[PDB]
Design a protein around this ligand. Structure first.
Ligand code: HEM
Ligand SMILES: [Ca+2]
Ligand SMILES: [Ca+2]
Length: 337
């Protein structure tokens, strides 16, 4: 079918998404950037989708509708859950856009995550399906993993929702394009790796370095020491990198960087459809732009060595990586406004 700007699609109902695409690239993402709004949007995909618990359903309680737009439709309720701190911002930015184009909140949330991540260097091209209903109920509280939860707790929660340990590590490739605002607000915008606009393996490398510094005035609930100035480290990411249930897969994105995009794409297609039936939605994947950028060689930061890595996968030694020349430069906070 014929869509705007001479573009075409197999299914006429995908056409509206080219217009949403044009809007959000130009306005929300400031010209196709992989910056704050994209990072916020990719996070919102998980905070909407993970409110899905077959464990609650089996006990005769409402378990949440999954990727259903509930965080947006019932924002007054969900954004005030403890685990949802920091999301009010992007929710309040996205809402009027989805209303304006008259697309469902659940569809919009996954679409902005998929469009946005495609802007990141070396980024993924996430499957995009359309047709989720705006009729749902608010997620139960206590379904979103928090950075001070144990690995056992996180793996049990993710597993209830349908993810294997290897899938959780893959989904955490998102932290390669990510920063925090709410754990230490004085360091709002400090990223989880040295390259928050590149979808690369530096996150998996740098979370394996020994933590040596407190970046702000003190540590805070959910934070641990950082290995590099300007970086921020989450308690959960540190533990997941070293725990025998997840440590080999973590390191596998360093040993085989090419595998990060496909494993992330497959896990996100599943996440994006929690509480949905794909055979009852429509496939609008061709609207998602093709990402640009080569798979980058992972490297050790300037001034670090292999001795600084806490290798944690017993079956397989940490790969030999190049080290950046010279002295390290403090990582910039992610910009903007
Ligand atoms: C597995 C358990 C996870 C935990 C404990 C976790 C924890 C966190 C925390 C604490 C932040 C900082 C929020 C702030 O203070 O601003 C964050 C940021 C982020 N999270 Fe995760 N996350 C997890 C999984 C995921 C998943 C599955 C995704 C998406 C597929 C994701 C995407 C992001 C993104 C893109 C950011 C950057 C947000 C920004 O720059 O404002 N996270 N995460
Ligand atoms: Ca939801
Ligand atoms: Ca990165």
């Amino acid at each position: 079918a014929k869509c705007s700007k001479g573009r075409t699609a197999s299914n006429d109902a995908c056409c509206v998404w080219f217009d949403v695409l044009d809007d959000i690239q130009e306005n929300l993402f400031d010209g196709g950037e992989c910056g704050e709004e994209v990072h916020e949007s990719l996070r919102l995909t998980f905070h909407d989708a993970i409110g899905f618990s077959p464990a609650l359903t089996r006990q005769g309680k409402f378990g949440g509708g999954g990727a259903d737009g509930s965080i947006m439709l019932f924002s007054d309720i969900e954004t005030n859950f403890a685990a949802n701190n920091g999301v009010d911002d992007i929710v309040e930015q996205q809402k009027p856009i989805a209303i304006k184009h008259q697309v469902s909140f659940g569809d919009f949330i996954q679409f902005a995550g998929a469009v946005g991540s495609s802007n990141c260097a070396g980024g993924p091209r996430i499957q995009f399906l359309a047709g989720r209903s705006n009729v749902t109920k608010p997620s139960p509280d206590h379904l979103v993993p928090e950075p001070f939860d144990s690995v056992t707790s996180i793996l049990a929660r993710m597993g209830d929702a349908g993810f294997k340990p290897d899938e959780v590590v893959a989904l955490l490739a998102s932290h390669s394009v990510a920063a925090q605002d709410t754990i230490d607000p004085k360091l709002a915008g400090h990223p989880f790796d040295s390259t928050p606009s590149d979808f690369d393996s530096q996150f998996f490398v740098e979370t394996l370095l020994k933590g040596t510094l407190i970046p702000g005035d003190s540590l805070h609930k959910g934070q641990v020491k950082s290995p590099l100035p300007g970086e921020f480290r989450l308690q959960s990411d540190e533990l997941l990198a070293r725990d025998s249930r997840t440590s080999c897969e973590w390191q596998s994105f360093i040993s085989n960087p090419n595998s990060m995009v496909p494993k992330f794409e497959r896990a996100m297609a599943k996440m994006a459809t929690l509480g949905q039936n794909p055979k009852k939605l429509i496939d609008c994947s061709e609207v998602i732009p093709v990402p640009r950028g080569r798979v980058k060689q992972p490297t050790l930061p300037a001034g670090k060595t292999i001795k600084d890595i806490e290798a944690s996968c017993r079956k397989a030694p940490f790969p030999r990586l190049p080290t950046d020349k010279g002295t390290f430069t403090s990582i910039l906070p992610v910009p903007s406004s």
